[PDB]
Write a protein that holds these residues in place. Structure first.
Motif, PDB file in Angstrom:
ATOM      1  N   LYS A  56       0.848  -1.187   0.000  1.00 56.48           N
ATOM      2  CA  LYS A  56       0.000   0.000   0.000  1.00 56.48           C
ATOM      3  C   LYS A  56       0.886   1.242   0.000  1.00 56.48           C
ATOM      4  O   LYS A  56       1.707   1.425   0.897  1.00 56.48           O
ATOM      5  CB  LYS A  56      -0.906  -0.021   1.237  1.00 56.48           C
ATOM      6  N   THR A  57       0.731   2.087  -1.015  1.00 55.70           N
ATOM      7  CA  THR A  57       1.546   3.293  -1.115  1.00 55.70           C
ATOM      8  C   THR A  57       0.878   4.511  -0.479  1.00 55.70           C
ATOM      9  O   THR A  57       1.531   5.524  -0.233  1.00 55.70           O
ATOM     10  CB  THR A  57       1.899   3.613  -2.590  1.00 55.70           C
ATOM     11  N   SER A  58      -0.420   4.409  -0.210  1.00 54.33           N
ATOM     12  CA  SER A  58      -1.150   5.511   0.407  1.00 54.33           C
ATOM     13  C   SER A  58      -1.369   5.237   1.892  1.00 54.33           C
ATOM     14  O   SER A  58      -1.363   4.087   2.331  1.00 54.33           O
ATOM     15  CB  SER A  58      -2.500   5.720  -0.288  1.00 54.33           C
ATOM     16  N   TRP A  59      -1.560   6.304   2.660  1.00 50.68           N
ATOM     17  CA  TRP A  59      -1.769   6.197   4.102  1.00 50.68           C
ATOM     18  C   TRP A  59      -3.091   6.833   4.503  1.00 50.68           C
ATOM     19  O   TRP A  59      -3.480   7.865   3.954  1.00 50.68           O
ATOM     20  CB  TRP A  59      -0.635   6.899   4.852  1.00 50.68           C
ATOM     21  N   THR A  60      -3.778   6.228   5.466  1.00 47.73           N
ATOM     22  CA  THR A  60      -5.056   6.759   5.927  1.00 47.73           C
ATOM     23  C   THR A  60      -4.851   7.761   7.062  1.00 47.73           C
ATOM     24  O   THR A  60      -3.790   7.796   7.696  1.00 47.73           O
ATOM     25  CB  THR A  60      -5.969   5.639   6.445  1.00 47.73           C
ATOM     26  N   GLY A  87      -0.109  -2.892   9.065  1.00 50.42           N
ATOM     27  CA  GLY A  87       0.537  -3.118   7.782  1.00 50.42           C
ATOM     28  C   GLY A  87       1.811  -2.350   7.486  1.00 50.42           C
ATOM     29  O   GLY A  87       2.205  -2.241   6.326  1.00 50.42           O
ATOM     30  N   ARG A  88       2.483  -1.845   8.515  1.00 49.26           N
ATOM     31  CA  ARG A  88       3.691  -1.061   8.289  1.00 49.26           C
ATOM     32  C   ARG A  88       4.902  -1.530   9.070  1.00 49.26           C
ATOM     33  O   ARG A  88       4.780  -2.013  10.197  1.00 49.26           O
ATOM     34  CB  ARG A  88       3.440   0.402   8.650  1.00 49.26           C
ATOM     35  N   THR A  89       6.069  -1.378   8.452  1.00 47.25           N
ATOM     36  CA  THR A  89       7.341  -1.725   9.072  1.00 47.25           C
ATOM     37  C   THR A  89       7.892  -0.431   9.668  1.00 47.25           C
ATOM     38  O   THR A  89       7.394   0.656   9.364  1.00 47.25           O
ATOM     39  CB  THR A  89       8.346  -2.214   8.032  1.00 47.25           C
ATOM     40  N   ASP A  90       8.925  -0.535  10.498  1.00 50.86           N
ATOM     41  CA  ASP A  90       9.500   0.665  11.096  1.00 50.86           C
ATOM     42  C   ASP A  90      10.078   1.631  10.061  1.00 50.86           C
ATOM     43  O   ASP A  90       9.911   2.846  10.183  1.00 50.86           O
ATOM     44  CB  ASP A  90      10.564   0.303  12.146  1.00 50.86           C
ATOM     45  N   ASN A  91      10.741   1.105   9.032  1.00 47.83           N
ATOM     46  CA  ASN A  91      11.313   1.978   8.011  1.00 47.83           C
ATOM     47  C   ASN A  91      10.245   2.717   7.222  1.00 47.83           C
ATOM     48  O   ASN A  91      10.429   3.879   6.852  1.00 47.83           O
ATOM     49  CB  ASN A  91      12.206   1.186   7.057  1.00 47.83           C
ATOM     50  N   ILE A  93       7.365   3.707   8.310  1.00 46.83           N
ATOM     51  CA  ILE A  93       6.881   4.784   9.164  1.00 46.83           C
ATOM     52  C   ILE A  93       7.867   5.941   9.216  1.00 46.83           C
ATOM     53  O   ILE A  93       7.484   7.099   9.075  1.00 46.83           O
ATOM     54  CB  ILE A  93       6.627   4.275  10.601  1.00 46.83           C
ATOM     55  N   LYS A  94       9.139   5.617   9.421  1.00 49.89           N
ATOM     56  CA  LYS A  94      10.182   6.632   9.496  1.00 49.89           C
ATOM     57  C   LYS A  94      10.201   7.506   8.251  1.00 49.89           C
ATOM     58  O   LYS A  94      10.324   8.730   8.347  1.00 49.89           O
ATOM     59  CB  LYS A  94      11.556   5.982   9.677  1.00 49.89           C
ATOM     60  N   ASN A  95      10.083   6.883   7.082  1.00 51.19           N
ATOM     61  CA  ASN A  95      10.099   7.634   5.832  1.00 51.19           C
ATOM     62  C   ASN A  95       8.838   8.463   5.628  1.00 51.19           C
ATOM     63  O   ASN A  95       8.904   9.585   5.126  1.00 51.19           O
ATOM     64  CB  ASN A  95      10.301   6.692   4.646  1.00 51.19           C
ATOM     65  N   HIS A  96       7.694   7.913   6.020  1.00 49.55           N
ATOM     66  CA  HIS A  96       6.420   8.611   5.887  1.00 49.55           C
ATOM     67  C   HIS A  96       6.419   9.866   6.753  1.00 49.55           C
ATOM     68  O   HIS A  96       5.928  10.916   6.343  1.00 49.55           O
ATOM     69  CB  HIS A  96       5.273   7.688   6.311  1.00 49.55           C
TER      70      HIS A  96
END
Ligand code: NA
Ligand code: NA
Length: 102
Positions: A56-60, A87-91, A93-96
């Motif tokens: 998933k490239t988009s975030w809610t 559905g997310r890894t630490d990296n 999240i960090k990038n987002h």
């Protein structure tokens, strides 16, 4: 019997190799190959950090709010925040955060 603490680069490499062999769902079998680690530990290390896939490239907004509240609570602890996002890894999240929430 069970070891705790940080994952070594050797352990991470091993988990990836074993996932390619057994697939992402025989965690107890995969864990037999790692000294002192159990199925649950390997499963979380994969889903929260090692999995390279991008589904998933988009975030809610709901995800963003969880990250924001967790950041106010803990600061930049990506590995801990990753435990709160299914559905997310630490990296991821960090990038987002650095490119959209910061
Ligand atoms: Na083990
Ligand atoms: Na996660």
């Amino acid at each position: 019997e069970l070891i705790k603490g940080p994952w070594t680069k050797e352990e991470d490499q091993r988990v990836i190799k074993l996932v390619q062999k057994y697939g992402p769902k025989r965690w107890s079998v995969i864990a037999k190959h790692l000294k002192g680690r159990i199925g649950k530990q390997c499963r979380e290390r994969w889903h929260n950090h090692l999995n390279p896939e991008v589904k998933k490239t988009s975030w809610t907004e709901e995800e963003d709010r969880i990250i924001y509240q967790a950041h106010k609570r803990l600061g930049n602890r990506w590995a801990e925040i990753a435990k709160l996002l299914p559905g997310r890894t630490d990296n991821a999240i960090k990038n987002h955060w650095n490119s959209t929430m910061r």
